């Protein structure tokens, strides 16, 4: 069993992490939880075994803790990650990994010297919708892939005034997850075309974007908007032999918000299906309905266990992290719309 | 009744012009049809009243001819149009208007000096799918428009090798129509983002494209691909108060190919509907299913009638034509993908 520690006890901790970790008692043990103010959500029995503390000193000096999870405000992610590594602990950092690309390299350099692992929390690589699109692409039924389109939208027309930097916009906010999915499938692109804008409140950072990643002749589109009344399909994949369409997004989050935990009845209840229409070897057009693949954000921790306990490679490659961060930053080199060619 | 004449007697003339013109005998009379070589179709009883000739002068010298329709090979459009205007005739030209922007500008200057009308044939401005989207946009129900998406796709995976120039590709071929629709609604864009690729056969001109026209904060997307097994909606429109979605394209071409002529029972029969979902002034979400507006390519001739007889403005504005040609040309200004800003 690996002893882990969480830095921060906010909603992200209690909703997107603990439910999955506390469900793996035979593999993980939440030894510490750092934070300041409390929450009437601490008096709960489920956290009875945890040592909540307001001194990050006791956490990092614990020889038993092998993993620190940073779930605090974005501004503190870099420093907490660095301090944890200098203490000799592996680190999982929620988005953002670091404010800048240079800092990401810095963090990776320190970890490599100590021979430790530092990585972002890319839990959406395990979304049911995404996994279904992945299975469809790896089935080979679609032939050579020529286009992929991923949507992550809302219909939230009212935006309270809240100025910020690019890092506070939707491109960094949601694009980091959606683009990471694309990169995890096709790697690093040759070119990137950007369309970034602020539609709801002109005082705020972008709330609408579309990034087009070009891999040779394959174009991968990632887009989000807070002004979509009628939803687009969650994923669309076109290949020379056929198409795959998936409406509906992973339901883990919906369940968690409705106070339904992993393993519990009706968790991630999903009645959608992926549609697959292609031409088989015999030249006959076939149409199939795929039952959604199962999603499990917990797989992040099962992979971390592998890395820490057996030296297994990190579920998220360093290059995929840097590529993603680099694409995000270059989207601001010149006013939108713009196009760039990735050097490295 | 206005007398007209056609330069060229190919498929375009017998499929997209005559069926409509011959249904307006109280408005128009086809006096002559020029063609370099006699064609078998000239023997169809429906053309018995038409004088077919290989002597162009016999047409341009006819005092009663007021409109000349150029439907020959693209490379001869400028030459025939200029000759018709010099003979004092109004001119309607099939795609492409001219090979270049300068020639187009030259055609308009000549027409202006003679008080004549020269215009392209943009019949898709009367496609039922497009007209329904236009009605939705003009209804005000969607509120400020932020995104428009137009698709004109196929699933034709086989493309025999047939080298050519940019002018032979899908962008010039189909984009001329889809971009014209966007231009007729919003005008001249500030910027254009291009993605032009040749996927089926690398030896051939482009068969895949996506042009993004920006009008302030509004983005209009026009795209086509010959590798779409599962179709996208024909039009998608998103505004701040709602959305409009329309699957299915105008059915006039389908009827024409099935040998059903305009005015005949069942012509362009369409069972699709435009779907609308918006938030009303009271804050309630309203759902509406719109019956497709009726499309009629002959409305081009009804417009030419008014223009020629009563001096009504031409259905297509000069600026829209020049903007279209410029956008198409600049798509090959640099390697794809690319973005450009329009001075006009």
XYZ file of C-alpha atoms in Angstrom:
688
model
C 0.000 0.000 0.000
C 1.218 3.490 -0.901
C 0.707 6.337 1.557
C -0.443 9.497 -0.210
C -1.080 13.080 0.875
C -3.364 15.789 -0.480
C -2.442 19.461 -0.453
C -5.823 21.176 -0.247
C -9.275 19.989 0.796
C -11.482 21.828 -1.670
C -14.258 20.526 -3.885
C -11.746 19.029 -6.335
C -10.278 16.908 -3.536
C -13.563 15.632 -2.078
C -15.280 15.097 -5.447
C -12.713 14.131 -8.084
C -10.087 12.362 -5.970
C -11.047 10.937 -2.569
C -14.048 9.026 -3.938
C -11.692 7.107 -6.248
C -8.799 6.798 -3.779
C -10.867 5.775 -0.740
C -12.230 3.027 -2.977
C -8.732 1.503 -3.238
C -7.841 0.971 0.440
C -5.743 -2.093 -0.440
C -3.487 -0.005 -2.673
C -3.561 3.512 -1.236
C -3.742 5.138 2.167
C -4.595 8.800 2.601
C -2.199 9.628 5.418
C -2.362 13.421 5.366
C -4.504 16.276 4.109
C -3.082 19.776 4.316
C -5.345 22.846 4.333
C -6.346 25.940 6.330
C -10.065 26.525 6.973
C -12.024 23.288 7.438
C -15.431 22.188 6.135
C -18.437 20.507 7.802
C -17.531 17.806 5.294
C -14.638 16.728 7.556
C -16.753 15.527 10.483
C -17.626 12.617 8.182
C -16.659 9.027 9.122
C -15.239 8.301 5.657
C -12.336 10.626 6.510
C -12.047 9.316 10.074
C -8.720 7.604 9.306
C -7.159 10.759 7.841
C -4.872 13.189 9.629
C -5.988 16.688 8.606
C -3.289 19.294 9.258
C -2.662 22.993 8.796
C 1.110 22.549 8.626
C 2.587 21.303 5.351
C 5.728 20.730 7.421
C 4.489 17.476 8.957
C 3.379 16.192 5.552
C 6.639 16.575 3.602
C 8.834 15.351 6.459
C 6.909 12.066 6.626
C 9.252 9.334 5.311
C 6.194 7.172 4.636
C 4.416 9.439 2.135
C 5.358 8.485 -1.431
C 2.846 10.694 -3.260
C 1.668 14.260 -2.791
C -1.396 15.466 -4.717
C -1.659 19.234 -5.213
C -5.310 20.321 -5.399
C -4.960 23.932 -4.237
C -5.406 27.160 -6.206
C -3.514 27.363 -9.520
C -1.075 30.047 -8.333
C 0.362 27.678 -5.723
C 0.826 24.628 -7.934
C 4.405 25.335 -8.979
C 5.861 26.042 -5.537
C 4.036 23.178 -3.809
C 5.132 20.765 -6.545
C 8.750 21.871 -6.245
C 8.787 21.704 -2.428
C 7.284 18.211 -2.509
C 10.028 17.001 -4.884
C 12.843 18.498 -2.790
C 11.328 16.484 0.062
C 11.743 13.418 -2.135
C 8.072 12.833 -2.946
C 6.408 11.951 -6.254
C 3.815 14.539 -7.304
C 0.426 14.678 -9.033
C -0.635 18.246 -9.916
C -4.122 19.286 -10.924
C -4.505 21.673 -13.846
C -2.711 23.888 -14.343
C 0.520 21.883 -14.139
C 2.461 25.164 -14.117
C 1.699 28.717 -15.286
C 4.347 28.558 -18.011
C 6.085 26.082 -20.320
C 9.500 26.994 -18.896
C 8.353 26.093 -15.375
C 7.050 22.721 -16.554
C 10.536 21.893 -17.816
C 11.946 23.114 -14.505
C 9.640 20.808 -12.566
C 10.463 17.848 -14.823
C 14.211 18.482 -14.473
C 14.106 18.415 -10.674
C 12.038 15.209 -10.627
C 14.360 13.459 -13.084
C 17.450 14.213 -10.998
C 15.822 12.820 -7.838
C 14.520 10.013 -10.024
C 10.950 10.873 -9.008
C 7.731 11.350 -10.948
C 5.915 14.659 -11.400
C 2.816 14.643 -13.594
C -0.483 16.454 -14.230
C -3.887 14.967 -13.420
C -5.305 14.075 -16.858
C -8.279 12.114 -15.600
C -10.216 12.652 -18.816
C -8.085 10.111 -20.641
C -10.516 7.793 -18.930
C -13.813 9.427 -19.915
C -16.279 6.898 -21.329
C -17.062 9.035 -24.378
C -13.361 9.476 -25.128
C -12.529 5.807 -24.579
C -15.296 4.860 -26.981
C -13.800 7.122 -29.690
C -10.398 5.594 -28.955
C -11.752 2.062 -29.316
C -13.428 3.060 -32.585
C -10.175 4.519 -33.946
C -8.101 1.482 -32.915
C -10.651 -0.937 -34.388
C -9.459 -0.065 -37.874
C -13.030 -0.112 -39.141
C -12.725 3.576 -40.101
C -9.644 3.100 -42.268
C -7.069 5.910 -42.411
C -8.221 8.688 -40.062
C -8.621 12.073 -41.744
C -10.610 14.107 -39.209
C -11.435 14.173 -35.503
C -13.667 16.760 -33.823
C -14.085 17.156 -30.053
C -16.610 19.482 -28.397
C -16.843 20.686 -24.797
C -19.581 23.296 -24.587
C -22.219 24.843 -22.382
C -25.133 27.190 -22.697
C -24.253 29.719 -19.995
C -24.914 33.128 -21.616
C -24.403 35.130 -18.410
C -20.815 35.718 -17.334
C -20.138 37.741 -14.192
C -17.288 40.200 -14.700
C -13.940 38.657 -13.821
C -10.804 39.929 -15.645
C -7.817 37.606 -15.935
C -4.884 36.381 -17.991
C -4.880 33.827 -20.835
C -4.325 31.153 -18.192
C -7.754 32.021 -16.782
C -9.575 31.616 -20.126
C -11.477 28.642 -21.563
C -8.616 27.672 -23.882
C -6.362 26.883 -20.904
C -9.286 25.881 -18.688
C -10.906 23.246 -20.916
C -8.558 23.053 -23.887
C -5.875 21.540 -21.666
C -8.089 18.487 -21.184
C -9.544 18.174 -24.691
C -6.209 18.796 -26.446
C -4.487 16.351 -24.135
C -6.899 13.709 -25.391
C -5.954 14.449 -29.016
C -2.225 14.503 -28.269
C -2.501 11.212 -26.375
C -3.835 9.692 -29.599
C -1.721 11.303 -32.327
C 1.236 12.910 -30.607
C 2.698 16.252 -31.647
C 1.144 18.195 -34.567
C 2.892 19.909 -37.496
C 0.689 23.019 -37.454
C -1.967 24.603 -35.235
C -4.627 27.103 -36.277
C -6.248 29.195 -33.570
C -9.564 30.966 -33.124
C -9.889 32.441 -29.645
C -12.390 35.011 -28.460
C -14.402 36.602 -25.662
C -18.116 36.643 -26.473
C -20.171 36.890 -23.273
C -18.282 39.542 -21.256
C -15.643 41.639 -23.019
C -13.834 42.203 -19.700
C -13.088 38.500 -19.299
C -10.468 36.129 -20.776
C -11.572 34.034 -23.792
C -14.720 31.939 -23.324
C -14.769 30.504 -26.833
C -12.086 28.746 -28.827
C -11.356 26.332 -31.654
C -7.926 24.799 -32.066
C -7.122 22.810 -35.217
C -4.161 20.435 -34.896
C -2.678 19.227 -38.197
C -0.938 15.855 -38.335
C 0.115 15.488 -41.933
C -3.249 15.210 -43.679
C -5.243 14.458 -40.539
C -6.908 17.445 -38.885
C -7.942 17.225 -35.222
C -10.399 19.888 -34.056
C -10.968 20.859 -30.440
C -13.553 23.488 -29.560
C -15.597 24.908 -26.713
C -18.174 27.619 -26.350
C -20.394 28.793 -23.533
C -23.060 29.678 -26.120
C -24.366 26.343 -27.450
C -28.104 25.738 -26.900
C -28.290 22.571 -29.034
C -25.258 20.346 -28.454
C -22.943 19.064 -31.154
C -21.899 15.395 -30.890
C -19.258 14.884 -28.160
C -16.892 13.215 -30.644
C -16.856 12.871 -34.436
C -14.292 10.749 -36.270
C -14.012 10.461 -40.046
C -11.781 7.960 -41.824
C -11.469 6.846 -45.441
C -13.667 3.816 -44.790
C -16.210 5.236 -42.367
C -17.422 7.515 -39.603
C -17.933 7.337 -35.837
C -20.343 9.672 -34.007
C -20.832 9.928 -30.213
C -23.375 12.160 -28.493
C -23.144 12.595 -24.744
C -20.259 13.099 -22.358
C -18.873 10.798 -19.648
C -21.330 10.713 -16.726
C -18.945 10.252 -13.773
C -19.106 13.976 -12.984
C -22.894 14.083 -13.250
C -23.129 11.216 -10.750
C -20.612 12.712 -8.307
C -22.515 16.017 -8.262
C -25.732 14.089 -7.509
C -23.887 12.598 -4.536
C -23.446 9.147 -6.084
C -20.023 7.593 -5.418
C -17.966 5.134 -7.523
C -19.058 1.514 -7.243
C -22.415 2.673 -5.909
C -25.623 1.759 -7.816
C -26.360 3.798 -10.927
C -22.922 5.412 -11.009
C -22.024 6.946 -14.373
C -25.390 5.786 -15.728
C -25.125 6.339 -19.486
C -27.853 5.505 -22.015
C -26.051 6.889 -25.057
C -24.305 4.827 -27.699
C -21.602 5.509 -30.240
C -22.637 5.166 -33.876
C -20.264 3.515 -36.332
C -20.930 3.338 -40.082
C -18.246 1.899 -42.320
C -17.532 -0.254 -45.369
C -16.188 -3.700 -44.422
C -13.579 -5.773 -46.286
C -16.305 -7.229 -48.524
C -17.313 -3.711 -49.542
C -20.648 -3.800 -47.710
C -21.765 -0.772 -45.681
C -22.281 -1.736 -42.033
C -23.746 0.330 -39.179
C -23.048 -0.569 -35.543
C -24.174 0.833 -32.175
C -21.377 0.800 -29.613
C -22.275 0.483 -25.951
C -20.157 3.185 -24.249
C -16.836 2.052 -22.799
C -16.635 2.336 -19.021
C -14.866 5.360 -17.577
C -12.917 5.430 -14.326
C -10.952 8.465 -13.178
C -9.519 6.076 -10.626
C -7.346 4.590 -13.359
C -5.074 7.600 -12.829
C -4.196 6.177 -9.416
C -3.910 2.595 -10.679
C -1.296 3.888 -13.129
C 0.490 5.908 -10.444
C 0.660 2.725 -8.363
C 2.344 0.997 -11.313
C 4.917 3.771 -11.729
C 5.748 4.157 -8.065
C 5.680 0.448 -7.173
C 7.040 -1.189 -10.344
C 8.840 1.576 -12.222
C 6.143 1.408 -14.905
C 6.264 4.400 -17.284
C 4.048 7.367 -16.409
C 0.541 7.162 -17.877
C 1.184 10.651 -19.261
C 4.363 11.173 -21.279
C 6.520 14.219 -20.595
C 6.464 15.175 -24.275
C 2.649 15.175 -24.338
C 2.650 17.616 -21.409
C 5.134 20.019 -22.972
C 3.452 19.849 -26.373
C 0.072 20.692 -24.825
C 1.544 23.594 -22.825
C 3.378 24.858 -25.887
C 0.269 24.808 -28.080
C -1.633 26.765 -25.429
C 1.007 29.514 -25.187
C 1.555 29.963 -28.925
C -2.169 30.556 -29.319
C -1.418 34.008 -27.953
C 1.652 34.938 -30.036
C -0.520 37.000 -32.372
C -4.148 38.184 -32.309
C -6.738 35.540 -33.242
C -7.270 34.101 -35.790
C -3.742 32.810 -36.345
C -1.742 29.830 -37.536
C 1.630 28.487 -36.444
C 3.992 25.645 -37.259
C 5.398 23.667 -34.338
C 9.184 23.721 -34.579
C 10.422 20.851 -32.402
C -41.501 38.778 -72.206
C -37.716 39.187 -72.368
C -35.803 37.289 -75.065
C -32.623 35.576 -73.937
C -29.943 33.368 -75.447
C -27.502 30.768 -74.196
C -23.847 30.414 -75.052
C -23.265 26.723 -74.494
C -25.616 23.764 -74.513
C -24.134 21.298 -72.054
C -25.512 19.666 -68.928
C -25.591 22.859 -66.898
C -27.798 24.519 -69.517
C -30.258 21.603 -69.795
C -30.393 20.838 -66.075
C -30.020 24.066 -64.136
C -31.331 26.705 -66.536
C -33.830 25.493 -69.131
C -36.111 23.562 -66.755
C -36.698 26.845 -64.920
C -36.684 29.244 -67.864
C -39.084 27.124 -69.919
C -41.483 27.248 -66.951
C -41.596 31.059 -67.271
C -42.787 31.474 -70.872
C -44.865 34.494 -69.814
C -41.671 36.211 -68.619
C -38.919 34.855 -70.865
C -38.458 33.435 -74.358
C -35.302 31.551 -75.356
C -34.573 32.927 -78.811
C -31.192 31.330 -79.478
C -28.840 28.729 -78.131
C -25.303 28.844 -79.469
C -23.028 25.800 -79.398
C -19.785 24.989 -81.193
C -21.097 21.581 -82.274
C -24.632 20.264 -82.665
C -25.924 18.139 -79.786
C -28.432 15.211 -79.724
C -30.492 16.828 -76.974
C -31.513 19.595 -79.410
C -34.126 17.157 -80.789
C -36.163 17.011 -77.573
C -39.680 18.330 -78.302
C -39.431 20.811 -75.410
C -36.764 22.719 -77.378
C -38.704 22.851 -80.680
C -39.230 26.635 -80.440
C -35.524 27.351 -79.988
C -33.137 28.326 -82.779
C -29.852 26.449 -82.296
C -26.819 27.945 -84.018
C -23.035 27.774 -84.273
C -22.801 31.385 -85.451
C -22.431 33.559 -82.360
C -22.985 36.753 -84.340
C -26.504 35.580 -85.232
C -27.214 35.835 -81.508
C -25.292 38.945 -80.453
C -26.727 40.846 -83.417
C -30.333 39.995 -82.526
C -32.035 43.302 -81.495
C -34.558 41.536 -79.276
C -32.059 39.592 -77.150
C -31.629 41.331 -73.786
C -29.849 38.648 -71.773
C -27.034 36.304 -72.764
C -26.271 33.346 -70.472
C -22.687 32.051 -70.705
C -22.500 28.336 -69.856
C -19.413 27.285 -71.818
C -16.059 26.121 -70.494
C -14.754 28.231 -67.610
C -11.792 29.410 -69.706
C -14.060 31.176 -72.177
C -16.362 32.941 -69.717
C -14.477 36.234 -69.705
C -14.204 36.331 -73.493
C -17.869 35.560 -74.171
C -19.096 37.881 -71.394
C -17.012 40.781 -72.724
C -18.236 40.151 -76.266
C -21.865 40.061 -75.129
C -21.498 43.320 -73.193
C -19.883 45.018 -76.206
C -22.883 43.892 -78.262
C -25.060 45.715 -75.752
C -26.431 42.665 -73.965
C -26.962 42.018 -70.264
C -24.947 38.987 -69.159
C -25.468 36.108 -66.703
C -22.356 33.968 -66.204
C -22.061 30.451 -64.775
C -19.334 29.510 -62.273
C -16.564 30.646 -62.373
C -17.419 34.294 -63.129
C -13.889 34.966 -64.388
C -10.516 33.287 -63.951
C -9.277 36.264 -61.938
C -10.222 39.216 -59.743
C -8.870 41.764 -62.235
C -10.924 40.323 -65.119
C -14.011 40.411 -62.904
C -13.318 44.048 -62.096
C -12.889 44.698 -65.824
C -16.237 43.076 -66.634
C -18.071 45.267 -64.094
C -16.416 48.477 -65.350
C -17.417 47.682 -68.932
C -20.996 46.839 -67.916
C -21.297 50.054 -65.904
C -20.132 52.222 -68.818
C -22.882 50.721 -70.972
C -25.610 50.720 -68.359
C -25.749 46.942 -68.591
C -25.870 44.196 -65.984
C -23.231 41.459 -65.735
C -23.582 38.960 -62.885
C -22.706 35.404 -61.832
C -25.366 32.670 -61.487
C -25.651 32.098 -57.723
C -28.714 29.867 -57.737
C -27.884 28.331 -54.352
C -29.056 31.569 -52.783
C -32.414 29.958 -53.363
C -31.635 26.531 -51.863
C -34.368 25.574 -49.375
C -31.864 24.607 -46.661
C -30.088 27.955 -46.935
C -33.323 29.964 -47.050
C -34.539 28.261 -43.874
C -31.299 29.153 -42.076
C -31.599 32.724 -43.413
C -35.158 32.945 -42.092
C -33.992 31.655 -38.706
C -31.131 34.163 -38.627
C -33.427 37.019 -39.671
C -36.122 36.040 -37.132
C -34.210 37.550 -34.215
C -35.059 34.500 -32.084
C -31.414 33.378 -31.827
C -30.236 36.797 -30.699
C -26.752 37.993 -31.629
C -25.278 35.435 -34.038
C -21.865 34.095 -33.071
C -21.395 31.047 -35.276
C -22.588 29.646 -38.594
C -21.448 26.320 -40.006
C -22.146 25.129 -43.553
C -21.409 21.631 -44.873
C -21.475 20.330 -48.437
C -20.053 16.818 -48.201
C -20.039 13.412 -49.925
C -18.763 9.906 -49.363
C -16.945 9.174 -52.639
C -13.673 7.488 -51.554
C -12.495 6.712 -55.098
C -10.788 9.449 -57.086
C -9.060 8.494 -60.308
C -5.765 10.276 -60.892
C -6.434 13.499 -62.781
C -3.842 16.251 -62.174
C -4.892 19.872 -62.304
C -4.469 23.383 -60.933
C -6.006 25.015 -57.844
C -8.927 26.114 -60.045
C -9.922 22.477 -60.611
C -10.248 21.656 -56.923
C -13.214 21.455 -54.575
C -12.598 24.883 -53.026
C -13.082 26.710 -56.332
C -15.653 24.148 -57.438
C -18.004 24.040 -54.451
C -16.678 26.736 -52.170
C -17.747 29.367 -54.679
C -21.379 28.510 -53.821
C -21.180 27.896 -50.099
C -19.033 30.982 -49.465
C -21.375 33.072 -51.626
C -24.250 32.163 -49.287
C -22.263 33.350 -46.256
C -21.212 36.514 -48.057
C -24.821 37.293 -49.047
C -25.728 37.189 -45.321
C -22.776 38.920 -43.704
C -20.775 40.637 -46.421
C -16.996 41.086 -46.509
C -15.096 39.339 -43.672
C -12.194 40.836 -41.716
C -10.115 37.648 -41.808
C -10.128 34.223 -43.437
C -8.577 30.997 -42.134
C -7.880 28.308 -44.760
C -7.484 24.511 -44.569
C -7.248 23.010 -48.065
C -6.219 19.374 -48.536
C -6.085 16.607 -51.157
C -6.915 13.370 -49.316
C -8.230 10.745 -51.739
C -5.511 10.987 -54.385
C -2.394 13.051 -53.726
C -1.972 13.551 -57.467
C -5.247 15.519 -57.697
C -6.265 19.096 -56.773
C -7.854 19.627 -53.325
C -11.002 17.641 -52.479
C -11.280 18.818 -48.890
C -11.548 22.316 -47.463
C -12.700 24.451 -44.576
C -12.811 28.221 -44.846
C -13.500 30.323 -41.775
C -14.753 33.843 -42.380
C -14.574 36.245 -39.458
C -16.924 39.205 -39.038
C -15.950 40.847 -35.787
C -16.791 38.305 -33.099
C -18.817 36.231 -35.570
C -17.308 33.194 -37.294
C -18.844 31.519 -40.349
C -17.475 28.114 -41.320
C -17.787 26.626 -44.807
C -16.456 23.150 -45.435
C -16.640 20.117 -47.677
C -15.018 16.713 -47.830
C -15.523 13.678 -50.045
C -14.935 11.425 -47.032
C -17.984 11.783 -44.785
C -19.862 8.521 -44.277
C -22.193 9.981 -41.649
C -23.358 13.462 -42.668
C -23.153 16.591 -40.548
C -26.171 18.881 -40.362
C -26.389 20.988 -43.568
C -26.405 24.210 -41.498
C -25.743 25.041 -37.865
C -26.324 28.530 -36.438
C -25.608 29.533 -32.841
C -26.664 32.845 -31.339
C -26.669 34.204 -27.790
C -30.324 33.243 -27.247
C -30.426 29.920 -29.075
C -29.565 27.577 -31.928
C -30.861 26.397 -35.303
C -29.982 23.049 -36.875
C -30.904 21.759 -40.325
C -30.129 18.316 -41.694
C -30.663 17.781 -45.403
C -29.939 19.805 -48.508
C -32.269 21.445 -51.028
C -33.933 18.713 -53.121
C -34.216 20.421 -56.541
C -31.068 18.711 -57.831
C -32.306 15.330 -56.635
C -35.591 15.835 -58.489
C -33.897 17.143 -61.639
C -31.639 14.071 -61.763
C -34.692 11.848 -61.263
C -36.241 13.491 -64.323
C -38.846 15.493 -62.398
C -39.114 19.046 -63.734
C -40.061 22.284 -61.915
C -43.790 22.684 -61.374
C -44.457 18.953 -61.665
C -46.066 17.209 -58.682
C -43.446 16.128 -56.153
C -40.683 18.403 -57.470
C -38.063 18.960 -54.778
C -40.249 17.095 -52.258
C -38.541 17.523 -48.886
C -39.422 15.872 -45.574
C -36.683 17.464 -43.487
C -37.240 20.303 -41.054
C -35.181 23.032 -39.478
C -34.978 22.734 -35.709
C -34.842 25.749 -33.457
C -34.350 25.999 -29.698
C -34.142 29.413 -28.096
C -34.833 31.324 -24.893
C -37.749 33.762 -25.278
C -38.092 37.218 -23.716
C -39.764 35.543 -20.726
C -36.759 33.282 -20.158
C -38.558 30.084 -21.182
C -36.900 27.648 -23.589
C -38.934 27.295 -26.785
C -38.658 24.520 -29.356
C -39.725 25.083 -32.981
C -39.672 22.828 -36.034
C -39.569 24.885 -39.225
C -40.853 23.534 -42.520
C -38.181 24.097 -45.216
C -38.731 27.317 -47.139
C -39.388 26.447 -50.790
C -36.321 26.684 -53.003
C -36.463 27.779 -56.640
C -33.391 28.378 -58.819
C -35.644 30.212 -61.257
C -35.829 33.091 -58.816
C -32.537 34.191 -60.390
C -34.409 34.847 -63.618
C -37.273 36.508 -61.753
C -34.638 38.891 -60.338
C -33.027 39.531 -63.724
C -36.509 40.295 -65.046
C -37.055 43.046 -62.459
C -33.525 44.369 -62.835
C -33.746 44.569 -66.635
C -37.361 45.713 -66.872
C -37.741 47.966 -63.835
C -34.161 48.831 -62.953
C -34.332 46.905 -59.683
C -30.953 46.273 -58.038
C -29.272 43.039 -59.166
C -29.779 40.082 -56.802
C -26.012 39.734 -56.385
C -23.956 42.764 -55.350
C -20.694 43.534 -57.177
C -18.796 43.604 -53.866
C -20.008 40.102 -52.993
C -18.646 38.773 -56.272
C -15.248 40.430 -55.818
C -14.986 39.279 -52.201
C -15.696 35.678 -53.279
C -13.045 35.657 -56.024
C -10.469 37.290 -53.747
C -11.060 34.802 -50.924
C -10.729 31.854 -53.313
C -7.490 33.209 -54.819
C -5.848 34.026 -51.505
C -6.517 30.490 -50.325
C -3.575 29.461 -52.496
C -1.473 32.500 -51.575
C 0.557 30.396 -49.141
C 0.708 26.757 -48.034
C -2.244 25.422 -46.022
C -3.207 25.933 -43.289
C -3.055 29.721 -43.372
C -4.868 32.876 -42.302
C -5.236 36.236 -44.035
C -6.759 39.636 -43.351
C -8.884 41.225 -46.072
C -8.287 44.879 -46.910
C -11.671 44.509 -48.594
